[PDB]
């Protein structure tokens, strides 16, 4: 565990993280995909061996000794708001299980279902609150990765609110 488990946010490519493992915003089929998933495919392509897993689950595949946790959020284009919310909560609970099992002191994590799976809605708060519900009971240092300057500010403010 970390000495003093913390949450932090950085605005940069999650493929350049400084943590002991990474969460991929995966598709259910283990395909290279777009956005975070394509950056992860370029950096750790060996981690996509038998990475296919259903919506609301996470599957870890090693790239050398570096763990890639493939977490499959719902695509809100296909799910109802209600069923989507349930699956998004479940994906983060499975990430917390994997992070615990691996015994890492730190993890790099994107906000699941906030990009092309958002169904065209702003889901910063929804996705971040499910991340907190899952990860609050773990002792890994969590570093959240985003691209948007305004999202960096809102994520930072939400972390600071609880401290
Ligand atoms: C943190 C992060 N790493 S890679 C990435 N891409 C390529 C998607 C994008 N929005 O540019 C993000 C995000 N978010
Ligand atoms: Cl970058
Ligand atoms: Cl997404
Ligand atoms: Cl973003």
Curated annotation (Swiss-Prot):
Effect of residue 117 to V/W: Almost complete loss of mono-ADP-ribosylhydrolase activity
Domain Macro, first and last residues per copy: 4-163
Topology class, membrane: Peripheral membrane protein
Subunit structure: Interacts with mRNA-capping enzyme nsP1. Interacts (via C-terminus) with host G3BP1; this interaction inhibits the formation of host stress granules on viral mRNAs and the nsp3-G3BP1 complexes bind viral RNAs and probably orchestrate the assembly of viral replication complexes. Interacts (via C-terminus) with host G3BP2; this interaction inhibits the formation of host stress granules on viral mRNAs and the nsp3-G3BP2 complexes bind viral RNAs and probably orchestrate the assembly of viral replication complexes. Interacts (via C-terminus) with host NAP1L1.
Chain's role: Seems to be essential for minus-strand RNAs and subgenomic 26S mRNAs synthesis. Displays mono-ADP-ribosylhydrolase activity. ADP-ribosylation is a post-translational modification that controls various processes of the host cell and the virus probably needs to revert it for optimal viral replication. Binds proteins of G3BP family and sequesters them into the viral RNA replication complexes thereby inhibiting the formation of host stress granules on viral mRNAs.
Record note on domains: In the N-terminus, the macro domain displays a mono-ADP-ribosylhydrolase activity. The central part called, the alphavirus unique domain (AUD) has a zinc-binding function. The C-terminus region, also called hypervariable domain (HVD), is mainly disordered and binds several host proteins. This intrinsically disordered domain contains 2 SH3 domain-binding sites and 2 FGDF motifs necessary and sufficient for the formation of nsP3/G3BP complexes.
Protein name (record): Non-structural protein 3
Residue span relative to the full protein: 1334 to 1493 of 2474
